[PDB]
Amino acid sequence: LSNKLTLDKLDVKGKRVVMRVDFNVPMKNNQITNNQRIKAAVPSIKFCLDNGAKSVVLMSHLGRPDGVPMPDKYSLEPVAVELKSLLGKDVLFLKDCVGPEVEKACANPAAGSVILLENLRFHVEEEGKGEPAKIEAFRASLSKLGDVYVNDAFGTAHRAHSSMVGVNLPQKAGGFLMKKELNYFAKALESPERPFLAILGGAKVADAIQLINNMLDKVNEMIIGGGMAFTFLKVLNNMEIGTSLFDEEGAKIVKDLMSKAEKNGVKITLPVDFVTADKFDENAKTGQATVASGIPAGWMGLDCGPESSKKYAEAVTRAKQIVWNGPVGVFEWEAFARGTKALMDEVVKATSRGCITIIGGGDTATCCAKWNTEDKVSHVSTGGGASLELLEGKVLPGVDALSNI
Ligand SMILES: Nc1ncnc2c1ncn2[C@@H]1O[C@H](COP(=O)(O)OP(=O)(O)O)[C@@H](O)[C@H]1O
Ligand SMILES: [Cl-]
Ligand SMILES: [Mg+2]
């Protein structure tokens, strides 16, 4: 951020600050399961208040509600409650993020007010698909809520969404989390230790598969696990995959991606066995399957199996640097957590013999919290997809949109 305004050089005295944060925290049974992303924004929030900000208005998305209000399922209200404990200060929750009523609440706040808006993605204009004049009007509303703008939303920095690139105020500054994360990755990606292994898993398959092409120019090995594997195995092995996650669009490029991995000398490790479930539920009936057996109709693969764990461990043993986004199964549910646990054990062991290990993402970082490995890997990042986009070599949109020095 040498070329961008950052919060350390932003005059906030007497100013209303509107701040984009990544408060897309994991939720299970309606409780926040990891406050990592909230805690990570506290240094920028506190700095603003300590240096005399009139207000700090916080805005984020939660989940993928796709432009419809879903306060029953994706409200940020619980985050407001959690932010209070972590700050040592109260925070006021608004039930929308734009327009007359919100604008009134943010126009002239009492000194030191902290305000959290509702889920930005309840509006189609944030993404904005799920309309140009409506997008403009949305951006104009958000811009009224502060006098200056800070973006500390590292985990969302890969998204060219309205709150991330479309706020129109004279000074748009990077926050301290944005700076911390970009600095770590700048150093870690400049001359990676090799072999450099990317571990790709998770559930955002369509997006993740689109990152592989450029990542194949940077890494020496790739594990393709979690929900992503099934698209590859269906195409390459003609494997029956039942109701497992599948990306029809990404399927069309699987063979080209494997061709490019061969050309670039990147070893691809896919799973060979699975823990299956008869429905997407913590208490599903479970089974086992191999690539050769296929997965039965009406069943889904929700974890890898033991032979896959062995292959993943072999890649980890070869690695001198690892970047991991996306668990290799539904680790939130114990029936489907063994694969991710075993891989975490390997990654912690690797760190202890000098591997540089980077784990990132809202859910993937929660694996570190669950198994108490946050200080047993090199870096746990608030960005997952955002971090993979840095690995590709891009300038993230949320950084590009900041004010130039
Ligand atoms: N085989 C699978 N099927 C469906 N979901 C999966 C599978 N493997 C992992 N997941 C899920 O992936 C989610 C995390 O993916 P993602 O959101 O892309 O990662 P992150 O939050 O680190 O960016 C977890 O909630 C996990 O349950
Ligand atoms: Cl996706
Ligand atoms: Mg996630």
Both 166 and 204 in one domain: the answer is no
Place of tokens 């309606």: 30
Say how far apart CA 76 and CA 23 lie, in whole Å.
8
Q: Is 37 a catalytic residue?
A: yes
Look-up of token digits 């070869």: 318
CA dist., res. 204 & res. 115, Å (int): 30
364 C-beta closer than 6 A to ligand 1 = yes
Range of the domain at 188: 184-392
Ligand 1 pocket, residue 207 CB under 6 Å: no
Residues β-bridged to residue 162: none
Distance of alpha carbon 354 from alpha carbon 351, whole angstroms: 5
DSSP labels for 122-158? Answer: GSHHHH----HHHHHHHHHHHHTT-SEEEE--GGGTT
Distance CA 399, CA 172 (A): 10
What's the one-letter identity of residue 347? V
Catalytic (active site) residue 204:
yes
| Cα–Cα distance measured from residue 94 to residue 107, given in angstroms and rounded to the nearest whole number | 13
Place of tokens 């693969």: 301
Burial category of 269 from C-beta neighbours within 10 Å (exposed 0-12, middle 13-18, buried 19 and up): buried
Question: Given the CA of residue 303, which atom of ligand 1 is nearest to it?
Answer: 1
Write down the catalytic residue from 15, 20, 37, 139: 37
Q: State yes or no: is 39 an active-site residue.
A: no
**Span from the CA of 228 to the centroid of ligand 1 (angstroms):** 9
Q: Residue 107: count other Cβ atoms within 10 Å of its Cβ.
A: 11
For residues 94 and 20, state if they share a domain.
yes
Tell me what percent of the chain is helix, strand and coil, each rounded to the nearest 5.
40, 20, 40
Give the residue from 177, 212, 246 where a domain finishes. Answer: 177
User: What 8-state DSSP symbol labels residue 29?
Assistant: T
Per the CB < 8 A criterion, the answer to whether 41 and 175 are in contact is yes
Ligand 3 centre and the CA of 366: distance in Å? 10
Query: How many of the other CB atoms lie within 10 Å of CB of 320?
Result: 16
**Position 404 in a domain:** no
Our CA angle for 259, 260, 265, nearest 5°, is 100
Determination approach: X-ray
| DSSP per residue, 157-188 | TT---HHHH----S-EEE-HHHHHHHHHHHHH
Kindly state if the Cβ of 326 falls inside 6 Å of ligand 1. yes
3-class secondary structure, 28: strand
Determine whether 63 is an active site residue: no
Pairing of strands 273-277, 286-290: antiparallel
Out of 34, 232, 364, 377, mutate this one to test ligand 1's pocket (max ligand atoms within 8 Å of CB): namely: 364
CA 229-235-241 angle, 5° bins:
55
Instruction: State whether 169 and 234 are in the same domain.
Output: no
Report the alpha-carbon distance of residue 181 to residue 361 in Å, rounded.
Answer: 12
198/157 same-domain check? no
Domain total of the chain:
2
In angstroms, rounded to a whole number, what is the distance separating the alpha carbons of residues 178 and 1?
9
Instruction: Sort residue 68 into left (φ over 0), alpha (ψ -120 to 50) or beta.
Output: beta
Dihedral of alpha carbons 100, 104, 106, 107, sign: positive
CA 328 / ligand 3 centre spacing (Å): 13
Are 195 and 162 part of one and the same domain? no
| Contact assessment for residue 68 and residue 99, using Cβ atoms and an 8 Å cutoff | no
Those residues whose C-beta lies under 8 Å from the C-beta of residue 325, and which sit 6 or more positions away, are 199, 200, 201, 202, 208, 359, 360, 361, 364, 384, 385, 387, 388
Rounded Cα distance, 192 and 321, in Å: 7
Is the same domain home to 140 and 198?
A: no
Q: Choosing from 175, 202, 329, 362, which is the catalytic residue?
A: 362
Does residue 288 fall inside a structural domain? Answer: yes
Same domain, 111 and 138: yes
User: Is 333 domain-assigned?
Assistant: yes
210 and 170 within one domain: no
Nearest to 177 by CA among 152, 156, 157: 152
Q: Which CA distances in Å does 69 have to 24, 77, 121? A: 16, 14, 8
CA 268 to chain centre: 23
Q: End-to-end distance of the chain based on CA atoms, in angstroms?
A: 9
